[PDB]
Every structure is written in C-alpha cells, then in structure tokens.
Symmetry: D2
C-alpha cells in the first residue's frame, strides 16, 4: 500500500461546476473516482455531472444546511475520501476608492464565501471522514483547499480576497493538527493565474499580457495542472499541513 486509491472512492468538489473545480472533477473521474459537484451553478453543474457520471448538489458553501446536504450525498454515493474546496469569488475594490472606503458588505461577502465557506465544508466533511475506516496507507480522508498567491502577494484592490485566502492558508496547520488523531491530512494549494471563467471581463489582450509576466511557463495555468497537484496530494501520504504555490514562479506586483 503506497498511496490512497482514487478509483472507486468518492470526492466532494466545491466550485465543481467551473474552472479549477471542474478540471479536478475531470481528472479524478478519469482516475476512476466518483465525484460530487457542489456549486451554485445548477445548469453547468448538472451538465458536468452528466458528462462525468457524478452527482450534482446545489450548494452555497457558506450555509450549514447546504454543506450537510453535499456531504450526505457523497457518503450515500460511497466512501468519502477527499474534499476539494474550489468555491470562491474574487472581487476587486480598494481600501479607499474613488467613492470612499471599501464597502463593508463586499469585504464580508468575500470572507464569507471564501473563508467561512471553506471552513464550513471542512468541518462537515471532516466529521464524516472521521467515521471512515482507514485506507491501507492510514488515511481516513484528505482535504485540499484553494488559497491563492494573493495570500502572500496581494495586489492593489485585493484586500478582501487576500484576507480571505491568507485565512485559508493560515488555518491549514491548525486543522491538520486538529484532524491528526482522525488520520485526515489537510493541504492547501495557492494558485497564481489560471485560465478559468474567474477571468471573464479581463479582455483577451490583458490575459495574454498577464501570461507573459509569468516567469515559466509564460502563460496562464490550465485547470488540469491544478488537478494534477490535487492528485499528488491525495497520493502522497507525507503531504500535510502545508501550502503549495502553483504559479510559474510569478510574484504579483501592486498593479
């Protein structure tokens, strides 16, 4: 027994209707995993579930009842071995802008979806995973969350997003410590800039220009490359309590 098996195990992916979550769903399905997609986007989520043979659950990650429903769907499908938190939003607003201070509700909403939502999915999924029998490598399950390089390199306009993502990154260690007796590993990925619908409203010129600023490779990341690192986290028993930058070595500048 060298690593946790993806084949025939269940993986709950928030934000699974789009972008990195969708790419993760595709790779885990190709590996024989069974996916539960938890997202607000019912049309895309149901469609992807049909394409992959998974289950779609309409889920606002910030709500207790929705996290419960998503986790219960996964445990009904089979043995829940992985949570991948990809649900997130990335608004921009300066601390002091042209119209006065950053609106409070905008900061709160960003924190609520990205940080409180991620914790909400973690706590519910962890409670369920703790009831599993250990796999042959010892794990009851593995939790992967998505931060961002903004946790470390926050740009002008990203105070809220950075706060939320640094929150996600910072809680990796205490959660790993909390769940060590349950044999659940806890990891975070901090992506740089990836080609997903999160970038809709960045004109194609500006996207290509941003790709060109990445040291190597000089392009936006593919969702599959995120997914590849998720799989490695699942498969490597020693990866725990850590945040991994996945960013072509970029360091984001103020603008």
């Amino acid at each position: 027994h060298h690593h946790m098996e993806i084949r025939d195990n269940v993986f709950l992916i928030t934000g699974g209707a789009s972008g990195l979550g969708a790419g993760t769903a595709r790779l885990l399905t190709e590996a024989g995993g069974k996916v539960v997609l938890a997202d607000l986007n019912q049309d895309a989520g149901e469609a992807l579930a049909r394409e992959l043979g998974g289950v779609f659950v309409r889920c606002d990650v910030a709500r207790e009842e929705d996290a419960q429903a998503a986790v219960a769907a996964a445990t009904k499908l089979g043995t829940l071995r992985g949570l991948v938190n990809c649900a997130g939003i990335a608004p921009a607003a300066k601390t002091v802008g042209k119209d006065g201070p950053h609106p409070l509700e905008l900061f709160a909403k960003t924190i609520t979806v990205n940080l409180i939502g991620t914790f909400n999915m973690i706590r519910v999924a962890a409670a369920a995973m703790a009831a599993n029998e250990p796999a042959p490598t010892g794990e009851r399950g593995v939790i992967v969350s998505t931060a961002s390089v903004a946790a470390f390199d926050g740009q002008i306009g990203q105070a809220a997003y950075a706060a939320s993502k640094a929150g996600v990154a910072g809680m990796t260690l205490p959660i790993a410590r909390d769940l060590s007796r349950n044999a659940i590993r806890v990891m975070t990925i901090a992506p740089g800039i990836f080609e997903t619908p999160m970038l809709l409203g960045m004109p194609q010129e500006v996207q290509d220009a941003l790709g060109a600023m990445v040291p190597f490779p000089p392009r936006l990341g593919k969702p599959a490359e995120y997914a590849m690192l998720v799989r490695q986290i699942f498969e490597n028993p020693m990866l725990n309590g850590e945040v991994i930058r996945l960013d072509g070595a970029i360091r984001m500048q103020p603008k």
Copy 2:
C-alpha cells in the same frame, strides 16, 4: 527624522484592556492624545479619563461604530494612528466530541477579529487620507494585531488562526492600496502576553507557558507590545510587514 507622536491623535480599538490599554498609556506618555474604542464602557471611560483622552463605545464589526470612533478622533485633533487590538480568542476543534466545530463560533471569531479590523482600517484610512502629510511624509500609520497563531495555529485554534492569518495577509495589499495616500500599514503578531485574554487559564498553566518561551522565559508585558507600536509609528521605512513579537517561541499542537 520621524513622525512625532506628540500632539497627534491615536485611535486604539480594544483600548480598555490588555495590549490596547498598554499602547494607550505609552502613546499618552509620548504626548499623543488617545481615543479608546471598546465594548467595555466602565474600563474604557476610566482609562480615557486617566490618560486625558476620549472613550467611544465601539463594536468594531459595526459600520456606524467605526464611523463614530473615527469621528471622535478627528474632532479631538489630527488622526495619525490606528491601532487595532480588539479581538477574541475562542477555542474549538474542527471535529469535537459532540460534532463539528460550530459554524457560528467560527463566523463570530472571523467577524470580530478580521472583518472588524478591516472595518476600522477602511474608515480610519479614509479620514487619514484627508490629512496634510506630516513633515516626514506620512498622512498616517495603521497598526493591526495578528498573532503567532497566524503561523503556528494550535489544536482548537482554527478560527482564531484563520482570522489572524487574514489580518497578517492583508497587510501588504492594504499598504499597496494606501501608498498614494502616504499611509503606512503594519502588523504585529504577538506570542503570549499577560493580559485578561488569559483569564480562565489558571496561574500554574500560565507560568508553565512562560517557561516554554526561549527568551525571555515569561509572558510578554503590554508595554513591550506598546514599544513596538511606537517604533512602527516612528520608523518611516516600516511598511507592509508582519513582525513576530514572541520571545522566539513556536507554538506546538498542544
């Protein structure tokens, strides 16, 4: 050579107790005028009276309270400093005996410590941006309190660690946001300090904890946190950084 504390106004959240109180005392001794913003009327009004400053009852999570506290400061004089010390430190495991960590406890910790700190920053920064620059160039300086839990989160600290990591992580983008306004933004990450936050931890356990600090082998004094605040106000090159103030301790899981 540096921004003068003397004669300028300093808004200190959590200023009725502990680190905020200590900061208030030192800033007053340096000739600053303090506004103490806290939930605690009785302790806040006493200390403000003692220091010849002003107390404002302020829940840092509330927009209207933030506005009132900043307004008190701009009335008193030129607002040159915000020090965010308001915060709470609950303990609860991700998965407890009785089920998962309660969601509301997590949300409450995040709301006081992170959303509250941001709420004070945004309002205070808007007011500071209207100031004329001091002779050293600053319109103002914002200092926030994270914790070594931002980096060394222990068992039961997921909510506190998330909140404090948030505070630490936003230091840089807020510094970047306010660089055109000539406002510096810094964060102190304290280790373990002797304040009422340790009420409940019995004395033997506090002494044992002090003995785990490499040097000095004791709990931090509020004046020591306040010394670092004062350096941040006085040093024109400190911006966009998080400083651990912890006697070199690194917190273990338990």
Copy 3:
C-alpha cells in the same frame, strides 16, 4: 503534451548512492528514466548504478571539475532533463558549546557541501540544459533541490544545517527567475524526517518516538514518498520557484 516525459530522458541525482537520492533514482528508473548517480560513495553508487542500468560518477558536489564530469556523463547518456540535488550532510553543534564556540570549519563545511555544492551542480547542469531543444511542454529541463524543514524550524544544534538549507530554499526564486528565459523550472523540497542513513546516529527508539511526534502519518517518511514529489515536480509544468514542505505537518521544537 501534458507533461515532461521521464521515459528515455536522463536524470542526474546527487547523493544518489543512498537515502532520498537512491529512492529518487529507483522511482525515475521504474518510470523509464536513465539515471546518473553522483556521490562520494564509490561502492554503493557503482552498485546502485549497475542495478538500475545507469551510470555512476564519483563526485564531490563542491568541486567544479566533479560537477563538470557528472554533467558530461549525463549528456553522453542522452538528453539531460532533470537534476535532483540530494547530496548533503547534517552535523550538530551549538553556537556556544560546553567547550567554546561552534567550530568555524564545521559551519563552513556544512555550508560548502549543502549550499555551495548544490549551487555548483545547478549552474553546470543548467548550462547543459540550456542547450537542449525544449520538450513539447516547453521545458528544456527541471531542477529540484533538497532543503529541510530546518530552513524554517531549526533546532538547538542545527545553526549550520539550517543556514545551509535556508540558503537552498531562498535561492529557488532568483534561480527560477535567472533560468526563465532558458525554460528551466527550479523547485525545492523541504523534507521533515525521513528514514535514511542520515539518521545512523539516532537510536531506533529515538527514531520511533520522533515518528510518533509527526501529526500525520505518525512515522518517518519513506524515500519513495520524497521521490513521488520529485516526479510530480517534473510532470507539472506550473510548479516553479517554490519550496514544498514534505513533513507530515510536523514543526520541529528546540529539542
């Protein structure tokens, strides 16, 4: 198309006669890679090269001419696509001991083997890789070095080792920036505690107790688990300029 191929490409592994380097050589060889092992240990290195169908070079990583010889053996064998720096030593001595200060030569030697030696191998290998045609994914090659959690969590007695490994970790970014125009990715792994001959002086009992301190899994790392991460680095085109802790979420205490 999706990642750099290990099969039929050449991998130069310093410290390849033992422990993490040897485990990396085994995994890369299983994946069809051709290995050059570079090590001081002639007997073990030659025996492992023979077993894996690779090449051994007796090489002190601190010497220019040894790095040159190791790189020349690799380029003879085929297309040099990866360097893995595992050559290292881990002495212990306090800054101020019972008998006086930490000896200067012990500090210097640690830094020379672990930090100067790693850079020596990198610069020579990178110069070779820079002359490669790019692979389909765009990389001319990929460099992986070994730091340690001691870069961040240095214990009493570890000033020299910590300095050296923090140096390895900190140079990852500028070297990735230097080699971005050459399309060479540069990454660092920071292992926690792994079961290798580096632990020879630690009694079995103290190894087992230290294993029990690792949050999860409560054991020492396997060389294969280090190797798995090296493979991920090679295969993921977005991993660049980063240091990855591989440590079961442990944080090292002073003692």
Copy 4:
C-alpha cells in the same frame, strides 16, 4: 527595568566603516554606547572610530583570528551587550550568463563574507556575552544580523546574494534557541534598498527610479532608519528569533 541600557555599554559593529554599520555606530554613540567598529576599511574605520570616541579593529569577518580580536577589543572597552552584523557584499551574476555558468568563486565568496562571516562573528561574540552578568531586564546581550529582502524576493542575478541572506535569515531561530539558556536575543533585519556606498556604480537616475518603486516612502532608506530599528531590537526584551523586513513595502521584481 523596562529595557537594556545602551549608555556606557559596548556594541561591536561589523561593516562599521560605512553605510548601515556606520549609521548604526553613530546612533548608538549618540545614545551613549561605546562602539567597536570591525571592517576591512582601515582608513575610514579608524577615522570614524575616532569621530565616535570608540575603537577600530581591522577585521575580516571570515577569519577566526579577526573575530577574536574584534571581540577582545570590545570586552577590553567595557561590557559587550550587542553585536550588529553589517559586513557584506552584493555582487551580481546570473546562474547561466552569456559566457557560461556563474563562476563558482563568486558564489563562494559571497556566501563566505555574508553568511559564514556573520556566523563567525556570532559564535565568538556569543561566547563572550555568555560570560556577562545579566542586565536588569535579564539579557546578557543581543545579536542583530543583516539579511536583505533578497532572502525572499531574490532578483535575476542575485542567486549568490539571496542564498547568503536567506541563510542569515534562516539561522536566526536556531541560534536564538541555542542562546536562550545564555539569555542572548538573536534577531535579523532584512532591509530593502538603502542609500549607502553599496549602490556605488548604480547611476543616480537608476537609484532615483528604484526609490520611486518603493510603495511608501517613495525613496531609498536612510542608514539612520536602519539604526533606529537596531535600537528598538536592543530595547525590546520580547524581540527574539525573528526577521523584520525594513523596506517601504517593496517586493522586488525579477528585473
């Protein structure tokens, strides 16, 4: 009772003939401390030591005998309470240049002066401070070293400098741990960009342009501002085992 006294105590400052070391010397003297300046620069060191009423010792920080002489001069002068490591060099060379790889000697020399040299001074000064009676605040002494933002943000051409300064940063914690029983605090300052002779051969336009990149204040740091932070570290009993960026919030880009 609140903090260690600078007045009438002795401070050993390496690189004290120029720039940050010189500014430190001035500020500590103005506060009533007695300085020993340790530097290669005999003429400027002797002249400044005279100007400040202290002592100069020609000291190559990489040599054991020089460290010993410099520490001896300090303990003859009075009670040695602080060491400030400012001796350093910052050459530039790419990992792979136009003409071949980065010369090995250039990397080794940078590491030798900046890292080995800083450790050499620490171990000798620490052994001498360990023999002091504690000050009323409890310290026998305090050690301050100079890293750089290049420890974290290393630029193209800075592999050697970044390695050296990340080494200095990363050894802060184990050395603090080593010296805790001796009551000696150990700290590091990581400066951004400061107006000193280190920038000689950067033309004034390039210096002014780089100052304009500092988010706030939009200028180069003054040596006095470095020195102010050194004094805070001496006077704050709770600052230990930590690295402090002093940089106007800049993050250095590849070029």
